[PDB]
Write a structure and sequence with these properties.
PDB class: hydrolase
CATH topology: Methylamine Dehydrogenase, Chain H
Radius of gyration: 19 Å
Largest sheet: 4 strands, antiparallel
Strand content: over 45%
Keywords: 6-phosphogluconolactonase activity, hydrolase
Assembly: monomeric
CATH class: Mainly Beta
Distance between the termini: 10 Å
Name: Periplasmic gluconolactonase, PpgL
Entry title: the structure of Pseudomonas aeruginosa Periplasmic gluconolactonase, PpgL
Length: about 375
């Protein structure tokens, strides 16, 4: 049961770009890399539904040694050989683009410019029929909350459409808000229209980061980086969210820094995994109530490294893989798809500053 495993990375160290590995669902082994696509800081990977057209953010910023402006790059991917072919590359108009997503009709790539220095933004990039990117047509920056030093300017950390695709949600870690836009392709010159409400506030100094929706669009889950929490919302459609629940990621009595990072639901909708960084460095697993969407704590598993940046459940659910950015390693763990429990460490993979993981089956 063999899959391509594409690994995004930061390229300040040994990595030279996107690394292509092979994952075996039969034993959990990771082998490679087979190929590396040379490019600057390809830290987040987004595939079109064909699983052949790949969109990448080049998370460059002004204080870098190398390229200093944010870019987005598109690729074609051959899942037989592992080959990646660059199609196009354009500026995102702000530093550190760190996340992207395609509009539901494929007409645009929404980009989250994080921008360590002022100012971050949502950027809108048209996508041509051949998968090439066109220059930015819209840029939206935001007012910051100034509750934490990391919030003196706006920092967009994800851009996520509702599953029906009509609205685009943009958690801004510097604003303590999730901004909400209506997607209006009929207005090619400004496809993102501010909705009502225009945002969903989060607690002061909480740092909203990543948002996901349940498959049925009824609920949304949001990490709060600075507070070390995950928030549960009911999604009403029309771009409206109402708060249901907030849960700490670290136990009561945990002394040490915390940081909430990536989150993903399992393919059966039954479990939510959330990373907590800081001094905690755990994958936190919750059971998801299908009726209320609320979360019940199941377990915490040490990621055996520092700054876990992303993770991915394996396609069959019998493994989970964590990218430990500061440790320069991937870790593969056994997983029980029934209980959601994460077990024995099966392998550690040395890779420079890994930041994202994506599975594509080998035809």
């Amino acid at each position: 049961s063999l899959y391509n495993l594409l690994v995004g990375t930061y390229t300040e160290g040994s990595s030279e770009g996107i690394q292509v590995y092979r994952f075996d669902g039969a034993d959990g082994s990771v082998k490679g890399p087979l190929r590396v696509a040379h490019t600057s800081n390809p830290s987040y990977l987004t595939f079109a539904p064909d699983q052949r057209t790949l969109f990448v953010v080049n998370e460059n910023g002004r204080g870098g040694k190398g390229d200093t402006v944010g870019r987005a790059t598109s690729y074609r991917f051959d899942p037989i050989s592992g080959r990646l072919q660059q199609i196009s590359q354009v500026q995102t108009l702000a530093d550190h683009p760190t996340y992207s997503s395609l509009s539901h009709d494929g007409r645009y790539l929404f980009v989250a410019n994080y921008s360590v220095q002022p100012e971050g933004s949502v950027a809108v990039l048209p996508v041509r029929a051949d998968g090439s990117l066109a220059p930015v047509v819209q840029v939206e920056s935001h007012q910051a909350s100034k509750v934490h030093p990391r919030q003196v300017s706006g920092h967009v950390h994800s851009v996520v459409s509702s599953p029906d695709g009509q609205y685009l949600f943009a958690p801004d870690l510097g604003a303590d808000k999730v901004f909400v836009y209506r997607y209006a392709p009929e207005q090619a010159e400004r496809p993102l229209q501010a909705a009502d409400p225009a945002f969903v506030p989060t607690p002061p100094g909480s740092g909203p980061r990543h948002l996901i929706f349940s498959a049925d669009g009824r609920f949304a889950y949001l990490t709060l980086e600075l507070s070390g929490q995950v928030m549960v919302f009911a999604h009403e459609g029309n771009g409206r969210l109402r708060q249901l629940q907030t849960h700490d990621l670290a136990p009561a009595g945990f002394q040490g820094k915390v940081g909430a990072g990536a989150l993903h639901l399992s393919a059966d909708g039954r479990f939510l995994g959330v990373l907590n960084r800081g001094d905690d460095n755990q994958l936190v697993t919750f059971a998801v109530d299908p009726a209320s969407g609320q979360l019940r704590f199941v377990e915490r598993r040490s990621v055996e490294g520092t700054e876990p940046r992303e993770f991915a459940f394996s396609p069959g659910g019998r493994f989970v893989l964590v990218a430990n950015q500061n440790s320069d390693q991937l870790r593969v763990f056994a997983r029980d798809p029934q209980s959601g429990q994460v077990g024995k460490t099966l392998q550690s993979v040395e890779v420079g500053s890994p930041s994202d993981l994506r599975f594509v089956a080998v035809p």
